[PDB]
Design a protein around this ligand. Structure first.
Ligand SMILES: *C/C=C(\C)c1ccc(-c2ccc(N(C)C)cc2)s1
Length: 133
């Protein structure tokens, strides 16, 4: 099940703060962001993805083509330069962001009407579940 299209409403968020600490999010912003419910909007056609991660206090959008590396600035998250690559491992969509932090990226997959993802950085893993609106 590779079809990740949808507007995805958060149902569960685990260890979001540990992931943010690995990224060194400034502590005041981090303490606010840990409170916030996340929404993911995913538009997917062929290899082409347009993704928007939002809450009441952040906006983070990224467009990418599966299989095509891209230089990326992480902008509104942690303002770092990485070399990003998104690929399929079966029906798990896997992003690796090569740069300063180790083990950085995410894994995203579908279970029925739910979207599951892991956000990774350093030794930290944040686990999230969303439901298709
Ligand atoms: C396909 C999934 C992607 C591109 C993302 C999943 C989570 C993301 C994210 C979470 C939180 C923030 N901030 C600014 C707290 C930014 C991006 S992107």
């Amino acid at each position: 099940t590779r079809d990740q299209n949808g507007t995805w409403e958060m149902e569960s968020n685990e260890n979001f703060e540990g992931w943010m600490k690995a990224l060194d999010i400034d502590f005041a912003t981090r303490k606010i962001w840990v409170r916030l419910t996340q929404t993911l909007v995913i538009d997917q056609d062929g290899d082409n993805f347009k993704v928007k991660s939002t809450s009441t206090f952040w906006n983070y959008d990224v467009d990418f083509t599966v299989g095509v590396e891209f230089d990326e600035y992480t902008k509104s998250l942690d303002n770092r330069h990485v070399k990003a690559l998104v690929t399929w491992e079966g029906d798990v969509l896997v992003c690796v962001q090569k740069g300063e932090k180790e083990n950085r990226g995410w894994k995203k997959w579908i279970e029925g009407d739910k979207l599951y993802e892991e956000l990774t950085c350093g030794d930290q893993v944040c686990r999230q579940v969303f439901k298709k609106k």
